[PDB]
Structures are given as C-alpha cells and as structure tokens.
Amino acid sequence: GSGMDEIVKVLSQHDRILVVGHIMPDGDCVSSVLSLTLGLEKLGKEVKAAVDYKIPYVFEKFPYIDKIEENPNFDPELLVVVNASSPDRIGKFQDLLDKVPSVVIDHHSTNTNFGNWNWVDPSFAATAQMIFRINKALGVEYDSNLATLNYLGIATNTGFFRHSNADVRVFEDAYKLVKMGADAHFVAKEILENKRFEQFKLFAEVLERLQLLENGKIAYSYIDYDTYLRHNCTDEDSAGFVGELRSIRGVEVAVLFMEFPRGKIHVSMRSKDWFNVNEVAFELGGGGHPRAAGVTFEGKKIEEVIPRVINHLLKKFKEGVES
Ligand SMILES: [Cl-]
Ligand SMILES: [Cl-]
Fold it and tell me: What InterPro entries does the entry give (predicted)?
C-alpha cells in the first residue's frame, strides 16, 4: 500500500483534521492519537482528537489527555484513524468513512486497509513509532510533553522493553524521546503503579481456575462475566493477567478467556520461546504476533469457547513438538 511519504503528503495538504483512535483504547492508542494531534497542531492545523469510548483511569494524569473527546463538534476535511485494524474498531466514527477522505496509520498486520490512503507496517512494535516518524518528516519539533506522550505507546507495546519486539529500533526511538525530555518514570508509574485492590482479588480468581496441560507447558484460566461483576471489575482490570501466567517457570503458552460483556469472549494468548500463537489465533478467526495474539467471539458460551480453543491449541502444540 501507501508508504510513509504518501501519508506525509496527504497530511500536509489538509488543515482541518479529526484524529480517531479505537474503542477499548490502550497505551499505543492514546500515544498515537495525542502525538499525532499535537504534532499536527504544531504545524498550525486545526485538529480534534476522538475515541468513542471511556478513557481508562491510568491515563487521567497524562498531559493533554482531555484533548481526546467523545463528542467532537467538528467538520473535518480529513479523518486520520490510528492503531485501529478495522472500521468497527472506531465505534460511531466509522460513519465518517462514507463522508470524509480518510488516512489509516497502523502496525497491525490484520488491518483491512479501509482508508483512502493506508500506511500499515507490521514491523513496528507500536503505531506510536510510525507517528514519531511522520511528525519528524513533517518538521515537527518535540518538547518534553510531546516526547512523553510519544514514548507511552513504545513502552506499553514492548512491555516496557521486555518483549521479543524490544529491538534496536525500539531502543533507538526510546533513547531519542528520553533525550528530548520524555518522562519515562512518569509513564511507568501511571500505567503500572495504579493497581486496584479488586484487581488482586480478580487475579486470585484466575489462579483458582488455573489449569496446566502438556507437562506444565500450557497454562490457561478464565474470567466469566459474573466473576467480573463480583469484583466490581471490567476487562480493563484484567490487563496483563495473561502475561503473569506466561511468567510461570516452564510455561511455553498461556491463554486467558475473558467474558465481558455477556457472551463476548475474548481469548488472549501469550508464548515464551517458540510456539507461534498468531498461527493458532488466525486459524480461530483472530490474529496477532508470534508471542502475543488473540481472538474474540460473539454470541457463545464461555463453556463452548474454552474447550474448542484448547483443543486447537493442543493439536497445534503437538504438531509443533514433532519438529
Ligand atoms: Cl514481540
Ligand atoms: Cl500480557
């Protein structure tokens, strides 16, 4: 599809821009939305930012977080959708795709290329890294606030420099941003040192349901909808739980099944050394990365999804072991 140079040209040609992120926004969504919005505003453009979803509490102290609106009153010339793989992921703003020329910028290999112009590069760990390069190509100069906001998505999507994607390019980008004043400690404190007591109790439920398979190489658990309700939690509160299960010594693949809301089952998969969970996810209707992937089902009992997913995982695991 289009490369960065074409996207930079299109952005340079329009001065009234609506930047839209996806529902259930994460660090890379917030980082990409705000870094692009503020970068474009430094070029003098009139820019609003929007997400059709509540912003998670861990973002509440971030500079300019209030710039992300739920109901922008705005007549944009250009819609720029960041970090969203498909039109359904941007909620009510998908209606604008029929009316406003659109740019898509994303790192997800599952992106449906739904914009008029699309720059999709799955070699980046974070869409925020693509925004960083676009801002530089446009001539934007960062201050510490913009550096912090752009650092956020690189940090969150690499697990704060822990996952397999924490490579030279990630460390180069992070060093550049920290040199420009990015507050790495602030970002870690707000994202990671903000636990609710209810989250400890919710993870205790996960451990109570934990099952090991294949001589300890596979671990899985689940959170049904009533269990979220019992602890005054949503699927916001189980973020990172599946990584805790992968962190068990000897576990190669961890899987967590999450029902929220009723009958919506999200399956999060993580692997350690060799098992390609993106292949298992894709075969089930989802996708992702070799070490972290997922799939989402609508209209199914958690009791039906769990054994079907575990069955396919076990068959793929046995096939993988046989060299
Ligand atoms: Cl990775
Ligand atoms: Cl995780």
Answer: DDH_dom, DHH_sf, DHHA1_dom, Oligoribo/pAp-PDE_c-di-AMP_PDE
